[PDB]
Amino acid sequence: SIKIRDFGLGSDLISLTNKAGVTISFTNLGARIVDWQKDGKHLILGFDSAKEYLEKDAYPGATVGPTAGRIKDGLVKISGKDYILNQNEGPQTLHGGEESIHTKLWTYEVTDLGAEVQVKFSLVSNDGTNGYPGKIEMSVTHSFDDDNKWKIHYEAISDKDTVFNPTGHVYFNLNGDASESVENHGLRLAASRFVPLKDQTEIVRGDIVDIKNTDLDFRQEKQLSNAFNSNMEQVQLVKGIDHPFLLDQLGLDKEQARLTLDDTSISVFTDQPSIVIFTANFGDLGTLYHEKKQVHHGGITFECQVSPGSEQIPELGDISLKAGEKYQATTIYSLHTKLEHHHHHH
Amino acid sequence: SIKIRDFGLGSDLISLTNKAGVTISFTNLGARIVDWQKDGKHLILGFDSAKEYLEKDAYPGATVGPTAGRIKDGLVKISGKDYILNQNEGPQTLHGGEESIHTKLWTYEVTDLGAEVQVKFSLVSNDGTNGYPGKIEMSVTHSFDDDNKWKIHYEAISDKDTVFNPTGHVYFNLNGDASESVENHGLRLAASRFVPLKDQTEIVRGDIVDIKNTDLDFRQEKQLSNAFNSNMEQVQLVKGIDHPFLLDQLGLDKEQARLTLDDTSISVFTDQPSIVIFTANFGDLGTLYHEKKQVHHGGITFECQVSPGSEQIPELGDISLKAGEKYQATTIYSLHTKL
Ligand SMILES: OC[C@H]1O[C@H](O)[C@H](O)[C@@H](O)[C@H]1O
Numbered sequence A: 001s002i003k004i005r006d007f008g009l010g011s012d013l014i015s016l017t018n019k020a021g022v023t024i025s026f027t028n029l030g031a032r033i034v035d036w037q038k039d040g041k042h043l044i045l046g047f048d049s050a051k052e053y054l055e056k057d058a059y060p061g062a063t064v065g066p067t068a069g070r071i072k073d074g075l076v077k078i079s080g081k082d083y084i085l086n087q088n089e090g091p092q093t094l095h096g097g098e099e100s101i102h103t104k105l106w107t108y109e110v111t112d113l114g115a116e117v118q119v120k121f122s123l124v125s126n127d128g129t130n131g132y133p134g135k136i137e138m139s140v141t142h143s144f145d146d147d148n149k150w151k152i153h154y155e156a157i158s159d160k161d162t163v164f165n166p167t168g169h170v171y172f173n174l175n176g177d178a179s180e181s182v183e184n185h186g187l188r189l190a191a192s193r194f195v196p197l198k199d200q201t202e203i204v205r206g207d208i209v210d211i212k213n214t215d216l217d218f219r220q221e222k223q224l225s226n227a228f229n230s231n232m233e234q235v236q237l238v239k240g241i242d243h244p245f246l247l248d249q250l251g252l253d254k255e256q257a258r259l260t261l262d263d264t265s266i267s268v269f270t271d272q273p274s275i276v277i278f279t280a281n282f283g284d285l286g287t288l289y290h291e292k293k294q295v296h297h298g299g300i301t302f303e304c305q306v307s308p309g310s311e312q313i314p315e316l317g318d319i320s321l322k323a324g325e326k327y328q329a330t331t332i333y334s335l336h337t338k339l340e341h342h343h344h345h346h
Numbered sequence B: 001s002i003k004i005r006d007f008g009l010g011s012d013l014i015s016l017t018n019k020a021g022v023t024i025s026f027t028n029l030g031a032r033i034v035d036w037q038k039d040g041k042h043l044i045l046g047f048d049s050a051k052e053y054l055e056k057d058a059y060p061g062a063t064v065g066p067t068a069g070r071i072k073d074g075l076v077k078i079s080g081k082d083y084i085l086n087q088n089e090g091p092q093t094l095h096g097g098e099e100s101i102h103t104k105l106w107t108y109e110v111t112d113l114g115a116e117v118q119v120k121f122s123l124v125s126n127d128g129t130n131g132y133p134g135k136i137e138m139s140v141t142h143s144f145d146d147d148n149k150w151k152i153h154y155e156a157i158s159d160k161d162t163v164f165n166p167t168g169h170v171y172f173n174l175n176g177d178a179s180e181s182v183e184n185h186g187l188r189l190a191a192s193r194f195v196p197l198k199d200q201t202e203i204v205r206g207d208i209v210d211i212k213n214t215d216l217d218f219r220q221e222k223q224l225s226n227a228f229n230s231n232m233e234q235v236q237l238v239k240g241i242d243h244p245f246l247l248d249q250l251g252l253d254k255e256q257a258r259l260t261l262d263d264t265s266i267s268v269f270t271d272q273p274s275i276v277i278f279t280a281n282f283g284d285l286g287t288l289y290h291e292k293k294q295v296h297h298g299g300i301t302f303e304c305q306v307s308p309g310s311e312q313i314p315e316l317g318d319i320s321l322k323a324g325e326k327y328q329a330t331t332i333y334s335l336h337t338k339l
C-alpha cells in the first residue's frame, strides 16, 4: 500500500507498507526518510512534521550534499582551478553550505512495481549555487521492498566539471526512544582503519590510522559502550564517535556493517569506500523527538560516501565529477530479525 | 472556503473561494496563479497539472526573477564590479536564467482572515545561484478577498549587495478560451512613454519614446485590434506588443491600467514604475490550454516592475538591493462585473 498526505509547509509524507507489514515513510523536504517502524516501534529518529525539521534539526534522515562532510576552508580544486564554497561552519563548508539541498522541497514521482515501490525525488542545483559549478541535475531514489530492503540510489549529471559526493543522514536507535542511549547496541564493522580529526573544528588531521585491537575495532561484534567508555584521544575529542571509517573490502555484495539490538538487526551495504559514523554527541542539548528528550549518544548514523578530507588526503579518493559524466551511488539498509543471538544488559 | 489538493510532482494546488463565489487557485510550483474563474469562466490562462507547466511553458502565472525581463549579455554591475548571470536566451539573461525560481517548489503557509485569505510562499535563493550574489530570502504573498481583489506582495532580504526586480507573469484572456484572440478587449493604460526594442533579440534600443497620439496610446480606452493592426515599426518588429510602458503617475492608489471585455473588467494597481505588456505573439506555436490550441495574441500580460534595460538607460531606475535592506513591492488585480 502507498499513502500520501500533506506533511506541513507544502511538503508531503509518502508512506509505504510492504507485504510483511513493515512500514517506512519519506518526505520531499530534503528527499528524506521520516520513519521506519516494525511492530509499532521506531527503528530510526524522526519528527512528526516538516516544521520540526526546520526548527529543531534539519539533517536527520536527509539527503545531504552536494558534498557530504567538512571541506577545510571551503576550498576545492576543480580542473586546475581553486573554488571557494559557501562557508557555514566557521571557515568550513559543512554538508554543502547553508540552506542546502536538505532544506529544499524536491519534486517526485512514485513507481509501483508490486514487490517493490520506488520514490524518485528530483532537484536541480543551479550553476554557482553555494559556489558549486553546475548546473547539476540530481535525482535520489528511495525504494522499499517485500524483503525489507531500503535502498537509496543516487544519480547526477553536471553541465560543468564540479565536485559531487552526497550521502544519507539517517540516525538509527533500536530502542525506539531518543531518550535511550545506543550504548546497548552491538556493532560489527568491516573496517581496519580510520581518519582522525585535527581538533574541535573537526577537519581531518592528515593521516590514516590503523585501529585494530583498540576500542574502535569493531571487526568482531562488540557493544557500543566500549567505544563510548573509551578514553582514547579521538574519542575524547568529540565525546563519542564522529569519524570516517575506511572499508577493507569494497563492493555492494558485502555486508559492511551490522547494528543489532536483541532480535533486531540492520545490515549495511554500499558501493562507497567509507562510512562516516556519528553517534549524536549532543550532550545535554536534549532535542525532543516524539516528546522524548534526546540523550547524548541517542542515535547513530552510517553515512556512506567517499571519506571527507580527500582535499588533504588524496589517498581517500577523488570526488570530482566531469561534465557530462553520470554519477551513481547505491547504499542499502536491510532489516532482519533474529540474525544472531544478542542478549545483553547494561 | 479553502481547498488543497495534490497538483502533481509533489506540488500543491490551493484554491480559494470568496463570499461572491469567485474562485482563484495557486500552486507552490513557482508561487504561481493557476486559475481564476467566475461563473465557470476562466479569466486567465493556465494548465491542469504541474507536468504541463514543465513540459509546455513554465512562465504562465509564475513569479519570475530574481530579475524579470532581459538583461543584455547577462551583465550587471554591482558596487562597481561586473557580474555575469546565467545566459539562457542567446547571450541574454531572460527571467533570471535557466531553471529559475519559477520552476522551484516553494514552501507555503495559508492564513485565513475571514474576508481575506493569504497564501505566503517562501524560497531561499543561495548565494551564487545563476550568478546572483546572495543569500536572498524571498517571500511572495498571494491574497484574495471578498471584494474580488487579488493582491501580490513581495518581500526580500539579501546577505549581500545584489539585484532584485521580480514580477508576476499571469496572462489574461477574458474570452475564457486560448483559441480566441484578445483583439476584442479594450485596454486603458495611464502611460505616455514606452521603451523601444533594438531588434528581434528584444534587448532595449537605448531611448525612451513618447507614444502620445500613436497606435500605442491607450490613455483613452481602445480596442487592442487597433494596436494589433498598426504599422508602427515597433509593433511590426514583434508582431504585437512586447514592451515596457512607463507609468505617468506613481502610487498604489491609482488605477494604472484597465482590461475590459463586455460586462467584465480587470483593474491594475502597483507601486512599481512600469508595466511590461506582452500579447502572446506565439504565431503558430499552438500551445494547448485546456485542450484548446492557443492562437497568436491569445493572451496578454501586465508585468509590473522596474523597466528592463536599466543597465543601458539609467533613467529607468535602479534595481539594486543593498545587503540588509528590505525590498517590498505590491501589485493588485481587481475584478469588477458590471450591473
Ligand atoms: O549534525 C550534523 C552532523 O553530521 C555529521 O555526522 C558530522 O560529522 C557531525 O559532526 C555533525 O555535523
Ligand SMILES: OC[C@H]1O[C@H](O)[C@H](O)[C@@H](O)[C@H]1O
Pocket: B059, B202, B242, B243, B277, B278, B301
Ligand atoms: O514567454 C515569456 C515572455 O516573457 C515576457 O513577456 C517577454 O517580454 C516575452 O518576450 C516572453 O519571453
Ligand code: NA
Pocket: A005, A006, A010, A011, A012, B005, B006, B010, B011, B012
Ligand atoms: Na502536497
